[PDB]
Every structure is written in C-alpha cells, then in structure tokens.
User: Fold this.
Amino acid sequence: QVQLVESGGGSVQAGGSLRLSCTASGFTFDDSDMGWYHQAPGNECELVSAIFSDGSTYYADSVKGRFTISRDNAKNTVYLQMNSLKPEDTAMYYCAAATTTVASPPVRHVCNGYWGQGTQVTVSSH
Assistant:
C-alpha cells in the first residue's frame, strides 16, 4: 500500500527555512511523479512543487526561487527545501504521488490526509 510519512516541518519566523522529507514505502516510487501539497485553514489543497520521474520539476508561482524539490530514489524519499519562508506559507504539508494543480477528488484527498498525516509548517510574522 502507498504510505507516505512526512516530516521536517516546524515553527519558524518569517525569513526562516525548513527542509521537509517524505518517505514512500509500498509502491514503485522510482516510476512515480511526486508532489508536495499544502493547505492552511480555509484554503484549498494546492500543489506547491512536483518532481516528475524524469527529474524535471514544477513550482507554484508563489514559491519559485524560494523552494527546491528533489528526490532520492535509492531512499524512496522526496524533499522540499523551503527558504525565505513567509507567513502565507503556514499550512499542513502533504506528499503524494500526484502532481496536478487542479482541484479534483485525488488532489483533495491529499490534504484530507488520505495517504499520510502531513507535517505542520508555521511561519510567524516578526
């Protein structure tokens, strides 16, 4: 079974940084396009960044230049390096074998915690 385990969230001040990790067991990870999604209270489940199985990437416009997604197939892990954090980045972050931005049942399920518990990111104003 696809099981994702997110970690690396935290509570930081604006301008700070975090590195999220997502370990994948139970599926052909190396063949999967992987995404990081996020949701703050009242917001939709939105894709932050995707890394396709070919190693190319997609970034939401709001995080381009601040966040970097990567994967280590040998460790079945996806990472999200988050620099220059902003209060608006505050959210639960979830990993998934999903890489689309469109609100659809598969995407909504991600931020509902269908595949993993997520990791909390809280960024406080200075």
Q: What stands out?
A: The chain has one domain: 1-126. The two ends are 42 Å apart (CA to CA). The chain has one helix and ten strands.
